[PDB]
Design a protein around this ligand. Sequence first.
Ligand SMILES: [Zn+2]
Ligand SMILES: [Zn+2]
Ligand SMILES: [Zn+2]
Length: 178
Amino acid sequence: NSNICEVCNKWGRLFCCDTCPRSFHEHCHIPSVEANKNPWSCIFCRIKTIQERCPESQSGHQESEVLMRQMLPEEQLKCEFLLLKVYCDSKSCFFASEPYYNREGSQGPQKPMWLNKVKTSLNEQMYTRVEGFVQDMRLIFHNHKEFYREDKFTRLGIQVQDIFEKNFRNIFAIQETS
Ligand SMILES: [Zn+2]
Ligand SMILES: [Zn+2]
Ligand SMILES: [Zn+2]
């Protein structure tokens, strides 16, 4: 197995996947690494299994159909993985914890949002459809773009949004377009 966490790239107290060489800190894995379960398979392996079981799940989909899906176990897992893929980027630090807004010439957003809040919401089964999860995720970046205006720091929102959107199109097998 790897000797660093797959998500944050640090050593420490790591739990090892039994079916691939990845390793995780307890709360870096989403969901948090389970108390028992030998063998244990990580989220990457669980997602791979879904694709393997149903190869046709990789044929192209319309975003609108994806967003209306109810959050049954497989869609819950996919949104957990997509959240995890955003945490995998180091620039996620900027969006992880609860933000505050006091900048001359801007007003804070009406509905602040952050990754740890989305994490909690997923853990508490608060989203009933994929749409709920994706709306909160996109709201993170949209709030950032609006607040930081022409400051170059706005680009961090663009960059982390691009990682979210690429992973969304991959995980949920959105139909490729130009
Ligand atoms: Zn970690
Ligand atoms: Zn694995
Ligand atoms: Zn099938």
